[PDB]
């Protein structure tokens, strides 16, 4: 006794749920970040490296609370009879959490780091901040370690989701929709990050972590929806967090654009 | 502002928890599961059935519960500053429980049924549970899981250490610790449960869950008890390892009365 909703009814959870990504304008034609990593010509050390700074934290926060939000079910099917479609589902959220936590999809070890040095807010603090800080003075530095406010919205709804257990299904949901376009955003970021007249990227090796993650992106969470009442829970959350996950990277693009 | 207890101080609480599970007799040689699966002759269906029952949901709720434990620890982590050597204990444990999730490793890659039908409660269930079902009644099958004081008392100190931080390093500390011990003992056992005067389990390929696991927990042995990545690297400060020790007290004390609980059963 414990199953995911009928196709049909999950098959409607998916088409609302596509319709509050629209609607949080989280579209590669929409957001701000995407447009303005395509459209500025230049991005400075110190804007450049802000944006990573924040980036880094949010995708720290992004992998824990979604574990946590997976420990939340775990916590829940401990002492319930989930069945194996249920089952099937969570296997999915663990193993795309592992990409994270420990570069599963062999696209990732093909390119990260060993150990914990491949975490990928690790990996990223590694070769994009760090990179970006050499050119960037001690009081920058500090100010961009001072989280805007968008940002600080957004990691405090992961913090909710962290006890949630559809939390990690909802975060996963809209975050693998929108991760193509965040990591190319990234590219052309960073592609266009110069200290005095030259690349600080100017090395392809600089740009693993994106172009793994823009590969990886390139090659359901409905199914842990197991009422009626956790499918209307389950669009409200995906409301609220794609919102914020907008207004974050509307944030990126005004740092772009000041 | 998060870091592991140094080198020295860990080994001291490896050695106390090696001296914890010396007295917890979750030794090959003391616990009386261990012992009885060597010595019993034979088993019957509905006594090799009964213990197949309990350890299918012991095994799922060990495995849902230390990940919801790892998922306690992960939340800490979201609003702290793990260092790097902190962050190697974590992706341990996340490795290990994720065989039993997810059959990672290579000695369960291969083997194991793919998809949900591999998790290793469900491939227990499939490949152990239910040939022993076929040989007992639905009576059986329902006194069986009614489960017995001990396993309900163990079960309910994985549902607490389900939401602390320290629990999944309790856990995998351990049952890693055990686990090759638990799966010789299967292997025994199965082989001498009896229907028609022959035997239930009669091709290798009926044993390839515990087979599997023989040779699997080796490792997971090693990789809990590490030096440099094992469960005492999530230890943060001497206050939390003194938690550490206390709760591998109490539930290695739990795991060691359910087992004998095993033994009481293939015995009588
Ligand atoms: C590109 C977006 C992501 C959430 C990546 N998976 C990351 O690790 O930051
Ligand atoms: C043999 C003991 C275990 C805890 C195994 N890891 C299992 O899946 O049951
Ligand atoms: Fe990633
Ligand atoms: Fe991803
Ligand atoms: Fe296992
Ligand atoms: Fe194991």
Redesign the interface.
């Known amino acids: 006794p414990l199953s995911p909703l009928p196709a049909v009814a999950r098959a409607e959870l998916d088409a609302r749920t596509e319709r509050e990504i629209d609607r949080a304008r989280l579209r590669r034609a929409d957001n701000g970040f995407f447009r303005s990593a395509r459209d500025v010509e230049s991005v400075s050390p110190a804007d450049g490296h802000a944006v990573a700074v924040w980036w880094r934290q949010m995708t720290?926060?992004f992998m824990?609370?979604t574990?946590?939000?997976?420990?939340?079910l775990?916590?829940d099917?401990?002492?319930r009879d989930a069945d194996?479609?249920l089952?099937?589902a969570?296997?999915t959220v663990?193993?795309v959490?592992?990409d994270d936590?420990?570069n599963?999809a062999p696209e990732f070890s093909a390119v990260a780091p060993t150990?914990?040095?491949g975490?990928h807010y690790?990996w990223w603090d590694d070769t994009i901040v760090a990179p970006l800080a050499a050119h960037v003075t001690e009081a920058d530095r500090r100010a961009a370690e001072e989280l805007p406010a968008p940002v600080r919205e957004l990691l405090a709804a992961?913090?909710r989701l962290?006890?949630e257990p559809l939390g990690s299904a909802v975060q996963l949901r809209v975050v693998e929709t929108i991760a193509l376009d965040i990591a190319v955003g990234f590219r052309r970021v960073y592609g266009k990050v110069l200290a005095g007249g030259e690349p600080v990227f100017g090395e392809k090796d600089q740009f693993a972590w994106i172009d793994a993650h823009i590969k990886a992106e390139t090659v359901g969470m409905t199914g842990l929806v197991t009422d009626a009442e956790r499918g209307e829970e389950f669009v409200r959350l995906v409301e609220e967090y794609a919102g914020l996950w907008s207004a974050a990277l509307e944030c990126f693009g005004d740092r772009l654009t000041g």
């Open positions: 720290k926060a824990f609370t574990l946590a939000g997976l420990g939340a775990a916590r099917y401990a002492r194996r479609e089952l099937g969570f296997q663990y193993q959490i592992g936590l420990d599963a150990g914990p040095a975490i690790v992961m913090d962290a006890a």
